């Protein structure tokens, strides 16, 4: 007799349940349906405020217009250069917004994820410490810098033979420090649209200028690095300006604050006099080919994760290994590794080493001129 409550509730529970399950779908989707009529809103910066309601605004997508405000927008807030939402017919303020950052400031900002700390590398606690002091300290320990009477450092530029450990430094720094490093390969900045490289640079320093403290790390500047002429293609003119755009910001009138800059290059022989100069670049950081010590020191770091019978010829490998850069050594491991995988010996030895080493130092003959000091 009591089986009915189920047959009542059985129907009921499901029934009463499946009711809202399917009813909610209408609400969510309906929002999506309704929001359809809804509509775009022009953007622009206020050029100025003619009257409280009368505004001179240059469409962010073109020419200037006389327009008014809305009401509760805050005629007080509306100010020169303020980016505002604008109307597509009424053509008035649809709602003021903040200072964007384009779709390029993200890739160099929130994107570029550094790797392991600084310990990962080394061979010359020279720049590691030297950069750190200039760069890190002048932020968390600058409060006393003034007690000596010296502005924090300005900029630091690596410059060394291709493979001295430069690109690996920017990674180590942004990984450990962590704050607001925005990496600019100084190449993808170039576009083709008159001053399309001026806006990128402005946003870079603007974002950062506001977002500071921020680390600016430019990979290969030899691009915008340039040098000027007298002259070259009509193209070069674009870069220059752009090459200058930064120069004027790094110094010029408005004074960089909190936001610091790491300059990157292989060959500093190419760079413009007006860039290397303090007020723009403080002290240059050289990264020479690891010493026999530096090699050995770096050699045990890349070959450290390798299966090697009690025969590791570290003093032998490093020895024959001269003029070998930091990757010329890594390659040395990787090379031997191919001998390792090679024929068949899951476990490397002192044989698949030297063979590589010379092998690795053999083809190194195809690399004329690998040094270039600045000024």
């Amino acid at each position: 007799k009591l089986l009915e409550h189920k047959e009542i509730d059985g129907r009921l529970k499901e029934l009463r349940e499946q009711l809202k399950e399917l009813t909610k779908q209408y609400e969510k989707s309906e929002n999506d349906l309704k929001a359809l009529q809804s509509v775009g809103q022009i953007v622009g910066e206020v050029l100025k405020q003619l009257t409280e309601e009368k505004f001179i605004v240059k469409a962010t997508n073109g020419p200037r217009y006389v327009v008014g405000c809305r009401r509760q927008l805050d005629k007080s807030k509306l100010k020169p250069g303020t980016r505002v939402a604008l109307d597509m017919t009424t053509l008035t303020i649809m709602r003021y917004l903040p200072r964007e950052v384009d779709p390029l400031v993200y890739n160099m900002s929130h994107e570029d994820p550094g790797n392991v700390s600084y310990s990962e590398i080394g061979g010359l606690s020279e720049q590691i410490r030297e950069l750190r002091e200039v760069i890190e300290l002048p932020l968390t320990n600058p409060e006393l810098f003034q007690r000596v009477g010296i502005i924090p450092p300005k900029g630091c530029l690596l410059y060394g033979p291709p493979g001295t450990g430069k690109t690996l430094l920017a990674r180590a720094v942004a990984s450990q420090l962590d704050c607001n490093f925005l990496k600019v390969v100084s190449s993808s900045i170039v576009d083709k649209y008159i001053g399309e490289s001026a806006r990128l640079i402005r946003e870079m320093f603007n974002y950062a200028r506001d977002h500071q403290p921020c680390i600016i790390f430019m990979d290969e500047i030899d691009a915008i690095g340039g040098r000027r002429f007298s002259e070259g293609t009509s193209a070069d003119r674009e870069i220059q300006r752009t090459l200058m755009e930064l120069l004027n910001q790094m110094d010029g009138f408005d004074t960089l604050h909190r936001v610091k800059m790491i300059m990157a290059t292989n060959r500093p022989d190419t760079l413009d006099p007006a860039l290397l100069r303090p007020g723009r670049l403080d002290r240059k950081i050289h990264i020479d080919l690891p010493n026999e010590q530096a090699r050995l020191d770096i050699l045990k770091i890349h070959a450290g994760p390798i299966t090697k019978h009690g025969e590791i010829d570290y003093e032998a490998i490093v020895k024959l290994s001269d003029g070998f850069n930091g990757a010329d050594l890594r390659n040395v491991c990787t090379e031997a590794g191919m001998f390792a995988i090679r024929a068949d010996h899951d476990f490397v030895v002192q044989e698949d080493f030297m063979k590589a080493v010379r092998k690795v130092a053999d083809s190194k003959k195809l690399e004329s001129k690998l040094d270039y000091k600045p000024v």
Binding site: G62, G195, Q240, T242
Partner: protein, 70 residues
């Protein structure tokens, strides 16, 4: 040798209207923005009063070896 300092000094002690316009800003993504500014800075200069228009790095604007076609 200290030219950008000289402008900072003048904008400091100064008294008129120091316009700091960079020659690298004049060229935009538009076909008339440049003149439209100069007419502005120059227009604004007339309005302000004895004003200092200052152009840091006029190279970005004036570089002789022009090339009409690009």
């Amino acid at each position: 040798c200290g030219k950008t300092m000289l402008a900072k000094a003048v904008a400091h002690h100064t008294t008129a209207a120091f316009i700091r316009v960079v020659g690298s800003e004049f060229v935009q993504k538009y076909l008339g923005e440049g003149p439209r500014m100069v007419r502005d800075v120059f227009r604004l200069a007339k309005e302000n009063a004895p004003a200092i228009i200052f152009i840091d790095e006029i190279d970005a604007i004036a570089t002789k070896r022009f090339d009409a076609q690009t």
